[model samples]
Target: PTAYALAISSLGEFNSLTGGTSTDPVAEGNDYYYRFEIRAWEGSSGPQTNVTLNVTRTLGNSTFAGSGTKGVDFEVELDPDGPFGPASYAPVLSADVQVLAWGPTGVQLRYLPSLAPGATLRFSLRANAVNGTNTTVQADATSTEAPGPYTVFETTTIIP
Candidate 1:
């Protein structure tokens, strides 16, 4: 069987409350959702396989600091082997998945009203893979069918 690894592909940051000079506080509860998608491809045709994909957000450097390197973990399944014929597609292959702030499934803090004038918030994503019963896989390992080296995603939310 064939397996695919997971990694952060890209990162994006936006200030709903833009138009500030130097730095601005992100308005809390503004309803913003950051999205990330994991991909896996098969070398050759084979039986259906299952894999576990995980994503995490860690605290990055900032002037206004409260916690350091705190990580939030989220998991999802990636099935390159689709339901129809030769495992054509699955969930992760569909579209980008939204990751919420504060918790995995809860309130979205697109812009936190509690941030200071120049305070900034930064987050990052790291991905890992889980192999099936009969498959060759590695931790955070990707397939040759995939593109590029490691995929790293980050976002910066500034208070305005």
Candidate 2:
């Protein structure tokens, strides 16, 4: 059987704060990561089976769809100057993934990588369903666990 293609919007950011010059000092930088999850049928089922997964970063306002072997993974850096930039200063990174089991339901994917100063991070995902001539695309009937554009996480550190 063939697999299904999946795509998710930027779910949100996981921020890591670093550096301190004094007791009342602000952080030096923040690292941001984006995350999302996907699930599709694998022909036979006792429950919905989690298939291989991939993530890609597109322009903040870009939209994606359809099936194939392109636009599968991506990465961005978040930093002090903020997500918006001077254009030439922006650098991009990308990666590919093959998720086996996600949490208990195979629907809780996340990205938590370190970031640097003056950089802004963005994240998203797409899933490819193994398809044959008999493959079907049914509407996902699962309830969403979180609401809105994305969730945010703050960070703290101990000097020890």
Candidate 3:
């Protein structure tokens, strides 16, 4: 079995309020911003089944002070109509479709179907910053099959 080769990339971050695309200086205290196109590509010969994709976060002292609080929180949205949305977007994960499990650190999603060779999976993650802090987020893909344990992709954003 050929272990899947995973490649992850970021399509940049957007301001949830204005719907603008950029991460130069994310707003703080209720100024929501999110990253998009956090995608994973399968560049292998064989298909991968029962794959689990996990996302984790590391916050600087500024953001950690208010972690899990009402003003400061993290959210993950699987597939939106666009980088923006259909106005009614929800996160879900499943075998036939997609399955999602969200937490304070990040999110864990399972792709129950066989991920075919050369296929890609994308994710959209957002956060509300209560203070001017920097946060690092990472995503990794793994499977129970042989030749497992793939790559980890990470991105950092500044909230001001």
Highest lDDT: give the candidate number: 3
The sequence of per-residue lDDT tens digits that candidate 3 reaches over residues 1-160 is 5455544455555554224456635546544444433222344556656666666765542122223322123333333233333434344343243435556566665656665554544444555554456666666666545244454544444565
Model 1, 81: alpha-carbon shift in Å? Answer: 10
TM-score of each: 0.31, 0.23, 0.58
lDDT value, residue 41 of candidate 1: 29
By TM-score, the better pick of 2 and 3 is 3
Poorest lDDT segment (10 consecutive residues) of candidate 2: 134-143
- Model 3 clash pairs? 93-98, 93-99, 93-100, 94-98, 94-99
- Tens-digit lDDT string for candidate 1 (70-145): 2323222233332223533222311233333333212121211221111122222211111122111111212233
Stretches > 4 Å off in candidate 1: 1-8, 11-26, 42-50, 60-151
**Predictions ranked by TM-score, top down?**
3, 1, 2
The TM-score between candidate 3 and the true structure equals: 0.58
Off by over 4 Å in 3: 1-3, 16-20, 30-43, 61-100, 145-148, 151-155
Candidate models: Cα lDDT each: 0.27, 0.25, 0.47
Error of 3 at 109 (Å): 1.0
